[PDB]
Symmetry: C5
């Protein structure tokens, strides 16, 4: 579950930069 | 699972402020 | 897992209204 | 877990049509 | 869980191309 929460976190920042460009 | 649902919740609000700027 | 799928569902509609405003 | 991955898939397409309108 | 993280990854890229068009 450790590497599983680390992989989901990566995609998390991927969505962050998303709102950054659209915002 | 407690801290796991608390970490996902944080990102949840992160997406909320997202629709706020785009909306 | 029941309340866990009910909490994720709530955020689900939260994203729905999101595409509604942006769409 | 079967119906759990089928419920998440539904929301998946819900987000797809989202990028479709915004794109 | 292996095929489960591979199915979620697919949708991941699905959201990526999303910010690409909107950005």
């Amino acid at each position: 579950e450790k590497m599983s929460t680390a992989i989901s976190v990566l995609l998390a920042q991927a969505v962050f930069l998303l709102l950054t460009s659209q915002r």
